[PDB]
Amino acid sequence: GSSGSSGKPIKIRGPSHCAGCKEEIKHGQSLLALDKQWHVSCFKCQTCSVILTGEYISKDGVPYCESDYHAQFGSGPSSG
Ligand SMILES: [Zn+2]
Ligand SMILES: [Zn+2]
């Protein structure tokens, strides 16, 4: 009897991959947000997809701008 074969490449090359494009952030830069690491051109709203650098609001673990966010949970009833 002869059986047994294993061997897989380790993808431990430059960890902390971009949580937006899934790309190793070694040659470029990263952005701290939601306990994650995103590129300077990847971190943007989830509803409008607008680059967030100045101010932003995170919801249920999702980056949002003062526009959508305030329009999603910010606005409610008529007088909202
Ligand atoms: Zn990226
Ligand atoms: Zn937005």
Side-chain angles (χ1 to χ4, degrees):
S2 272
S3 206
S5 178
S6 303
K8 279 86 160 62
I10 187 65
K11 301 211 161 274
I12 60 91
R13 65 201 61 157
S16 302
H17 319 116
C18 184
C21 59
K22 273 89 160 183
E23 281 177 42
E24 166 186 297
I25 302 158
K26 278 286 270 203
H27 295 310
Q29 214 91 102
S30 59
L31 205 170
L32 272 299
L34 288 75
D35 278 292
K36 269 154 188 277
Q37 283 195 35
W38 323 61
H39 285 146
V40 186
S41 55
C42 285
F43 194 47
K44 38 171 79 152
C45 194
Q46 175 54 238
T47 296
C48 68
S49 84
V50 72
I51 301 285
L52 307 158
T53 53
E55 295 171 82
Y56 86 97
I57 323 153
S58 70
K59 213 277 169 209
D60 185 67
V62 191
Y64 289 113
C65 65
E66 306 210 295
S67 204
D68 290 316
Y69 187 109
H70 277 252
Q72 266 185 72
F73 311 78
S75 170
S78 187
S79 273

Coordinates of all heavy atoms in Angstrom, one line a residue:
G1 N 0.8 -1.2 0.0 CA 0.0 0.0 0.0 C 0.8 1.3 0.0 O 1.8 1.4 0.7
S2 N 0.5 2.2 -0.8 CA 1.2 3.5 -0.9 C 0.3 4.6 -1.3 O -0.3 4.7 -2.4 CB 2.3 3.4 -2.0 OG 3.5 2.9 -1.5
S3 N 0.0 5.5 -0.3 CA -0.8 6.6 -0.4 C -0.4 7.8 0.5 O 0.1 7.6 1.6 CB -2.3 6.2 -0.2 OG -3.2 7.1 -0.9
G4 N -0.7 9.0 0.1 CA -0.4 10.2 0.9 C 0.3 11.2 0.1 O 1.4 11.0 -0.4
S5 N -0.3 12.4 0.0 CA 0.4 13.5 -0.7 C -0.2 14.8 -0.3 O -1.4 15.1 -0.4 CB 0.1 13.3 -2.2 OG 0.7 14.4 -3.0
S6 N 0.7 15.7 0.2 CA 0.2 17.0 0.7 C 1.3 18.1 0.4 O 2.5 17.8 0.2 CB -0.1 17.0 2.2 OG -1.1 16.0 2.5
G7 N 0.9 19.4 0.4 CA 1.9 20.4 0.1 C 1.2 21.6 -0.5 O 0.8 21.6 -1.7
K8 N 1.1 22.7 0.3 CA 0.4 23.9 -0.2 C 1.3 25.1 0.2 O 1.9 25.2 1.2 CB -1.0 24.1 0.4 CG -2.0 23.3 -0.3 CD -2.1 21.9 0.2 CE -3.4 21.2 -0.1 NZ -3.7 21.1 -1.6
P9 N 1.3 26.1 -0.7 CA 2.1 27.4 -0.5 C 1.5 28.3 0.5 O 0.3 28.4 0.6 CB 2.0 28.0 -1.9 CG 0.8 27.5 -2.5 CD 0.6 26.1 -2.0
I10 N 2.4 28.8 1.4 CA 1.9 29.7 2.5 C 1.8 31.1 2.0 O 2.7 31.7 1.5 CB 2.9 29.7 3.6 CG1 2.4 30.5 4.8 CG2 4.3 30.3 3.2 CD1 1.1 29.8 5.4
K11 N 0.5 31.6 2.1 CA 0.2 33.0 1.7 C 0.5 34.0 2.8 O -0.3 34.9 3.0 CB -1.2 33.1 1.2 CG -1.5 32.2 0.0 CD -2.6 32.7 -0.9 CE -2.5 32.1 -2.3 NZ -1.6 32.7 -3.2
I12 N 1.5 33.8 3.6 CA 1.8 34.7 4.7 C 2.7 35.8 4.2 O 3.4 36.4 5.1 CB 2.5 33.9 5.8 CG1 3.8 33.3 5.3 CG2 1.6 32.8 6.4 CD1 5.1 34.1 5.5
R13 N 2.7 36.1 2.9 CA 3.6 37.2 2.4 C 2.9 38.5 2.6 O 1.8 38.8 2.1 CB 3.8 36.9 0.9 CG 2.5 37.0 0.1 CD 2.7 36.3 -1.3 NE 3.0 34.9 -1.1 CZ 2.8 34.0 -2.0 NH1 2.2 34.3 -3.2 NH2 3.1 32.7 -1.8
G14 N 3.6 39.4 3.4 CA 3.0 40.7 3.7 C 1.5 40.6 4.1 O 0.7 40.8 3.2
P15 N 1.3 40.4 5.3 CA -0.1 40.3 5.9 C -0.8 41.7 5.9 O -0.3 42.6 5.3 CB 0.1 39.8 7.3 CG 1.5 40.2 7.7 CD 2.3 40.2 6.4
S16 N -1.9 41.7 6.6 CA -2.7 43.0 6.7 C -3.1 43.5 5.3 O -3.0 44.6 4.9 CB -1.8 44.1 7.3 OG -1.4 43.7 8.6
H17 N -3.7 42.5 4.5 CA -4.1 42.8 3.1 C -5.3 43.8 3.2 O -6.1 43.8 4.1 CB -4.6 41.6 2.4 CG -3.6 40.4 2.6 ND1 -4.0 39.2 3.3 CD2 -2.3 40.2 2.3 CE1 -3.0 38.4 3.3 NE2 -2.0 39.0 2.8
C18 N -5.4 44.7 2.2 CA -6.4 45.7 2.1 C -7.8 45.0 2.2 O -8.1 44.1 1.5 CB -6.3 46.5 0.8 SG -7.5 47.8 0.6
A19 N -8.6 45.6 3.1 CA -9.9 45.0 3.4 C -10.9 45.6 2.3 O -12.1 45.5 2.5 CB -10.4 45.4 4.8
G20 N -10.4 46.1 1.3 CA -11.2 46.7 0.2 C -11.0 46.1 -1.1 O -11.9 45.8 -1.9
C21 N -9.7 45.7 -1.4 CA -9.4 45.1 -2.7 C -8.6 43.8 -2.5 O -8.3 43.1 -3.4 CB -8.5 46.1 -3.5 SG -7.0 46.6 -2.7
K22 N -8.3 43.5 -1.2 CA -7.6 42.3 -0.8 C -6.2 42.3 -1.4 O -5.8 41.3 -2.0 CB -8.4 41.1 -1.3 CG -9.4 40.6 -0.3 CD -10.8 41.3 -0.6 CE -11.9 40.5 0.0 NZ -13.2 41.1 -0.2
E23 N -5.5 43.4 -1.2 CA -4.1 43.5 -1.7 C -3.1 43.8 -0.6 O -3.4 44.7 0.2 CB -4.1 44.6 -2.8 CG -4.6 44.2 -4.2 CD -4.6 45.3 -5.2 OE1 -3.6 46.1 -5.2 OE2 -5.6 45.4 -5.9
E24 N -2.0 43.1 -0.6 CA -1.0 43.3 0.4 C -0.5 44.7 0.5 O -0.1 45.3 -0.6 CB 0.2 42.4 0.2 CG 1.4 42.7 1.0 CD 2.6 41.9 0.6 OE1 2.6 40.7 0.8 OE2 3.6 42.5 0.1
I25 N -0.6 45.4 1.6 CA -0.2 46.7 1.8 C 1.2 46.8 2.3 O 1.5 47.1 3.4 CB -1.1 47.5 2.8 CG1 -2.6 47.4 2.4 CG2 -0.7 48.9 3.0 CD1 -3.6 47.6 3.5
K26 N 2.1 46.7 1.3 CA 3.6 46.7 1.6 C 4.2 47.9 0.9 O 5.0 48.7 1.4 CB 4.2 45.4 1.3 CG 4.1 44.4 2.4 CD 4.9 44.7 3.6 CE 6.3 44.0 3.5 NZ 6.9 43.9 4.9
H27 N 4.0 47.9 -0.4 CA 4.6 48.9 -1.3 C 3.8 50.2 -1.2 O 4.4 51.3 -1.3 CB 4.6 48.5 -2.8 CG 5.4 47.3 -3.0 ND1 6.8 47.2 -2.6 CD2 5.2 46.1 -3.6 CE1 7.3 46.0 -2.9 NE2 6.3 45.3 -3.6
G28 N 2.5 50.1 -0.9 CA 1.7 51.3 -0.8 C 1.4 51.7 0.6 O 2.2 51.3 1.5
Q29 N 0.4 52.5 0.9 CA 0.0 52.9 2.2 C -1.3 52.3 2.7 O -2.1 51.8 1.9 CB 0.0 54.4 2.3 CG 0.4 55.0 3.6 CD 1.9 55.3 3.6 OE1 2.3 56.5 3.5 NE2 2.7 54.3 3.8
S30 N -1.6 52.4 4.0 CA -2.8 51.8 4.6 C -3.5 52.9 5.3 O -3.0 54.0 5.6 CB -2.5 50.6 5.5 OG -1.6 51.0 6.5
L31 N -4.8 52.6 5.7 CA -5.6 53.5 6.4 C -6.4 52.8 7.5 O -7.1 51.9 7.3 CB -6.6 54.2 5.5 CG -7.1 55.6 5.9 CD1 -7.9 56.3 4.8 CD2 -8.0 55.5 7.2
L32 N -6.2 53.3 8.8 CA -6.8 52.7 9.9 C -8.3 53.0 9.9 O -8.7 54.2 10.0 CB -6.2 53.2 11.2 CG -5.0 52.3 11.7 CD1 -5.4 50.9 12.0 CD2 -3.8 52.3 10.7
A33 N -9.2 52.0 9.9 CA -10.6 52.2 10.0 C -11.3 50.9 10.2 O -11.1 49.9 9.5 CB -11.1 52.8 8.6
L34 N -12.2 50.9 11.2 CA -12.9 49.7 11.6 C -12.0 48.5 11.9 O -12.2 47.4 11.5 CB -13.8 49.3 10.4 CG -15.0 50.2 10.2 CD1 -14.6 51.5 9.5 CD2 -16.1 49.5 9.3
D35 N -11.0 48.8 12.7 CA -10.0 47.8 13.1 C -9.5 47.0 11.9 O -9.0 45.9 12.0 CB -10.6 46.8 14.1 CG -10.7 47.3 15.5 OD1 -9.6 47.5 16.1 OD2 -11.8 47.6 16.0
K36 N -9.5 47.7 10.8 CA -9.0 47.1 9.5 C -8.0 48.0 8.8 O -7.8 49.1 9.3 CB -10.2 46.8 8.6 CG -10.8 45.4 8.8 CD -12.2 45.3 8.4 CE -12.8 44.0 8.7 NZ -12.5 42.9 7.7
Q37 N -7.4 47.5 7.7 CA -6.5 48.3 6.9 C -6.9 48.4 5.5 O -7.0 47.5 4.8 CB -5.1 47.6 7.0 CG -4.4 47.8 8.3 CD -2.9 47.5 8.2 OE1 -2.3 47.7 7.2 NE2 -2.3 47.0 9.3
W38 N -7.2 49.7 5.1 CA -7.6 50.0 3.7 C -6.7 50.9 3.0 O -6.0 51.8 3.7 CB -9.1 50.5 3.7 CG -9.9 49.9 4.8 CD1 -9.7 49.9 6.1 CD2 -11.1 49.1 4.5 NE1 -10.8 49.2 6.7 CE2 -11.6 48.7 5.8 CE3 -11.8 48.7 3.4 CZ2 -12.8 48.0 5.9 CZ3 -13.0 48.0 3.5 CH2 -13.4 47.6 4.8
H39 N -6.6 50.9 1.7 CA -5.8 51.8 1.0 C -6.3 53.2 1.0 O -7.4 53.5 1.5 CB -5.7 51.3 -0.5 CG -4.8 50.1 -0.7 ND1 -5.1 49.1 -1.6 CD2 -3.7 49.7 0.0 CE1 -4.1 48.2 -1.6 NE2 -3.3 48.5 -0.6
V40 N -5.5 54.1 0.5 CA -5.9 55.6 0.5 C -6.9 55.8 -0.6 O -7.5 56.9 -0.6 CB -4.7 56.5 0.3 CG1 -5.1 57.9 0.4 CG2 -3.6 56.1 1.3
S41 N -7.1 54.9 -1.5 CA -8.0 55.0 -2.6 C -9.0 53.9 -2.6 O -9.7 53.6 -3.6 CB -7.2 55.1 -4.0 OG -6.4 53.9 -4.1
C42 N -9.1 53.2 -1.5 CA -10.1 52.1 -1.4 C -11.1 52.4 -0.3 O -12.3 52.0 -0.4 CB -9.3 50.8 -1.0 SG -8.5 50.1 -2.5
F43 N -10.7 53.1 0.8 CA -11.6 53.4 1.9 C -12.6 54.5 1.5 O -12.2 55.7 1.3 CB -10.7 53.9 3.1 CG -11.5 54.0 4.3 CD1 -12.3 52.9 4.7 CD2 -11.5 55.1 5.2 CE1 -13.0 53.0 5.9 CE2 -12.2 55.2 6.3 CZ -13.0 54.1 6.7
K44 N -13.8 54.1 1.3 CA -14.9 55.0 0.9 C -16.2 54.5 1.3 O -16.4 53.3 1.7 CB -14.9 55.1 -0.7 CG -14.6 53.9 -1.4 CD -14.8 54.0 -2.9 CE -13.7 54.8 -3.6 NZ -13.5 54.4 -5.0
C45 N -17.3 55.3 1.3 CA -18.6 55.0 1.7 C -19.0 53.6 1.1 O -18.4 53.1 0.2 CB -19.6 56.1 1.4 SG -21.2 55.9 2.2
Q46 N -20.1 53.1 1.6 CA -20.6 51.8 1.1 C -21.9 52.0 0.3 O -22.3 51.1 -0.5 CB -20.9 50.8 2.3 CG -21.6 49.5 1.8 CD -20.8 48.8 0.7 OE1 -21.3 48.6 -0.4 NE2 -19.5 48.5 1.0
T47 N -22.5 53.2 0.4 CA -23.7 53.5 -0.3 C -23.4 54.4 -1.5 O -24.0 54.3 -2.6 CB -24.7 54.2 0.6 OG1 -25.1 53.4 1.7 CG2 -26.0 54.7 -0.2
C48 N -22.5 55.4 -1.3 CA -22.2 56.3 -2.3 C -20.8 56.0 -2.9 O -20.4 56.4 -4.0 CB -22.2 57.8 -1.8 SG -20.9 58.2 -0.6
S49 N -20.0 55.3 -2.1 CA -18.6 54.9 -2.5 C -17.8 56.2 -2.6 O -17.1 56.4 -3.7 CB -18.6 54.1 -3.8 OG -18.7 55.0 -4.9
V50 N -17.7 57.0 -1.6 CA -17.0 58.2 -1.7 C -15.8 58.2 -0.7 O -15.9 57.8 0.5 CB -17.8 59.5 -1.3 CG1 -18.1 59.5 0.2 CG2 -17.1 60.8 -1.7
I51 N -14.6 58.5 -1.2 CA -13.4 58.5 -0.4 C -13.6 59.2 0.9 O -14.0 60.3 0.9 CB -12.2 59.1 -1.2 CG1 -11.9 58.4 -2.5 CG2 -10.9 59.1 -0.3 CD1 -11.2 57.0 -2.3
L52 N -13.3 58.5 2.0 CA -13.4 59.1 3.3 C -12.0 59.4 4.0 O -11.3 58.4 4.3 CB -14.2 58.2 4.2 CG -15.6 57.7 3.7 CD1 -16.0 56.4 4.4 CD2 -16.6 58.8 3.9
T53 N -11.7 60.6 4.1 CA -10.4 61.0 4.7 C -10.6 62.0 5.8 O -10.0 61.9 6.9 CB -9.5 61.7 3.6 OG1 -10.2 62.8 3.0 CG2 -9.0 60.7 2.6
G54 N -11.5 63.0 5.6 CA -11.8 64.0 6.7 C -12.6 63.4 7.8 O -12.1 63.2 8.9
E55 N -13.9 63.2 7.5 CA -14.8 62.6 8.5 C -15.7 61.5 7.9 O -15.9 61.5 6.7 CB -15.7 63.8 9.1 CG -14.9 64.8 9.8 CD -15.8 66.0 10.2 OE1 -16.5 66.0 11.2 OE2 -15.7 67.0 9.5
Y56 N -16.1 60.6 8.8 CA -16.9 59.5 8.4 C -17.5 58.8 9.6 O -17.0 58.9 10.7 CB -16.1 58.5 7.6 CG -15.3 57.5 8.4 CD1 -15.9 56.2 8.6 CD2 -14.1 57.8 9.0 CE1 -15.2 55.3 9.4 CE2 -13.4 56.8 9.7 CZ -14.0 55.6 9.9 OH -13.3 54.7 10.7
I57 N -18.6 58.0 9.3 CA -19.2 57.3 10.4 C -19.4 55.8 10.0 O -19.8 55.4 8.9 CB -20.6 57.8 10.7 CG1 -20.6 59.3 10.5 CG2 -21.1 57.4 12.0 CD1 -22.0 59.9 10.2
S58 N -19.0 54.9 11.0 CA -19.0 53.5 10.8 C -20.3 52.9 11.4 O -20.6 53.2 12.5 CB -17.8 52.8 11.4 OG -17.8 52.8 12.8
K59 N -21.0 52.0 10.6 CA -22.2 51.4 11.1 C -22.2 49.9 10.9 O -21.7 49.4 9.8 CB -23.4 52.0 10.4 CG -24.7 52.1 11.3 CD -25.4 50.7 11.3 CE -26.5 50.7 12.4 NZ -26.7 49.3 12.9
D60 N -22.6 49.1 11.9 CA -22.6 47.7 11.8 C -21.3 47.2 11.1 O -21.4 46.1 10.4 CB -23.8 47.2 11.0 CG -24.0 45.7 10.9 OD1 -24.2 45.1 12.0 OD2 -23.8 45.1 9.8
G61 N -20.3 47.9 11.3 CA -19.0 47.5 10.7 C -18.9 47.9 9.2 O -18.3 47.2 8.4
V62 N -19.5 49.0 8.9 CA -19.4 49.5 7.5 C -19.2 51.0 7.5 O -19.9 51.8 8.1 CB -20.7 49.2 6.8 CG1 -20.6 49.5 5.3 CG2 -21.1 47.8 7.0
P63 N -18.2 51.5 6.7 CA -17.8 52.9 6.5 C -18.9 53.6 5.8 O -19.3 53.2 4.7 CB -16.5 52.8 5.8 CG -16.5 51.5 5.0 CD -17.3 50.6 5.9
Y64 N -19.3 54.8 6.3 CA -20.3 55.6 5.7 C -20.0 57.1 5.8 O -19.3 57.5 6.7 CB -21.7 55.3 6.3 CG -22.3 54.0 5.9 CD1 -22.5 53.0 6.9 CD2 -22.6 53.7 4.6 CE1 -23.0 51.7 6.5 CE2 -23.2 52.4 4.3 CZ -23.3 51.5 5.2 OH -23.9 50.2 4.9
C65 N -20.5 57.9 4.9 CA -20.3 59.3 4.9 C -21.4 60.1 5.6 O -22.4 59.5 5.9 CB -20.1 59.8 3.5 SG -21.7 59.7 2.5
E66 N -21.1 61.3 6.0 CA -22.1 62.1 6.7 C -23.3 62.3 5.8 O -24.3 62.9 6.3 CB -21.5 63.5 7.1 CG -20.2 63.3 7.9 CD -20.0 64.5 8.8 OE1 -19.9 65.6 8.4 OE2 -20.0 64.3 10.1
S67 N -23.3 61.9 4.6 CA -24.4 62.0 3.7 C -25.4 60.9 3.8 O -26.5 61.0 4.3 CB -23.9 62.2 2.2 OG -24.8 62.8 1.4
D68 N -24.9 59.7 3.3 CA -25.8 58.5 3.4 C -26.1 58.2 4.8 O -27.3 58.1 5.2 CB -25.1 57.3 2.7 CG -24.9 57.5 1.2 OD1 -25.9 57.9 0.6 OD2 -23.8 57.2 0.7
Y69 N -25.1 58.0 5.6 CA -25.3 57.6 7.0 C -26.5 58.5 7.6 O -27.5 58.0 8.1 CB -24.1 57.9 7.8 CG -24.1 57.4 9.3 CD1 -23.5 56.3 9.7 CD2 -24.9 58.1 10.2 CE1 -23.5 55.8 11.0 CE2 -25.0 57.6 11.5 CZ -24.3 56.5 11.9 OH -24.4 56.1 13.2
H70 N -26.3 59.8 7.6 CA -27.3 60.7 8.1 C -28.6 60.5 7.4 O -29.7 60.9 7.9 CB -26.8 62.2 8.0 CG -25.9 62.6 9.1 ND1 -26.3 63.5 10.0 CD2 -24.7 62.3 9.3 CE1 -25.3 63.7 10.9 NE2 -24.3 63.0 10.5
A71 N -28.6 60.0 6.2 CA -29.8 59.7 5.4 C -30.4 58.3 5.6 O -31.5 58.1 5.3 CB -29.5 60.0 3.9
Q72 N -29.5 57.5 6.2 CA -29.9 56.1 6.4 C -30.5 56.0 7.8 O -31.7 55.6 8.0 CB -28.7 55.2 6.3 CG -28.6 54.5 4.9 CD -27.5 53.5 4.9 OE1 -27.6 52.4 5.4 NE2 -26.4 53.8 4.2
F73 N -29.7 56.3 8.8 CA -30.2 56.2 10.2 C -30.4 57.6 10.8 O -31.0 57.8 11.8 CB -29.2 55.4 11.1 CG -28.8 54.1 10.5 CD1 -27.9 54.1 9.4 CD2 -29.3 52.9 10.9 CE1 -27.5 52.9 8.9 CE2 -29.0 51.7 10.3 CZ -28.0 51.7 9.3
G74 N -29.8 58.6 10.1 CA -30.0 60.0 10.6 C -31.4 60.5 10.4 O -31.9 61.2 11.3
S75 N -32.0 60.3 9.3 CA -33.3 60.7 9.0 C -34.3 59.7 9.3 O -34.2 58.5 8.9 CB -33.4 61.2 7.5 OG -34.7 61.4 7.1
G76 N -35.4 60.0 9.9 CA -36.5 59.1 10.2 C -37.8 59.6 9.8 O -38.2 59.5 8.7
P77 N -38.6 60.1 10.8 CA -39.9 60.7 10.6 C -39.9 61.9 9.7 O -38.9 62.4 9.4 CB -40.5 60.9 12.0 CG -39.3 61.2 12.8 CD -38.2 60.3 12.2
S78 N -41.1 62.4 9.4 CA -41.2 63.7 8.6 C -40.3 64.7 9.1 O -39.5 65.3 8.4 CB -42.7 64.2 8.7 OG -42.9 65.3 7.8
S79 N -40.4 65.1 10.4 CA -39.6 66.1 11.0 C -38.2 65.5 11.5 O -37.8 65.7 12.6 CB -40.3 66.7 12.3 OG -41.1 67.8 11.9
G80 N -37.6 64.8 10.6 CA -36.3 64.2 10.9 C -35.2 64.9 10.1 O -34.3 65.5 10.8
Ligands
ZN1 ZN -7.0 48.6 -1.6
ZN2 ZN -22.2 57.9 1.4

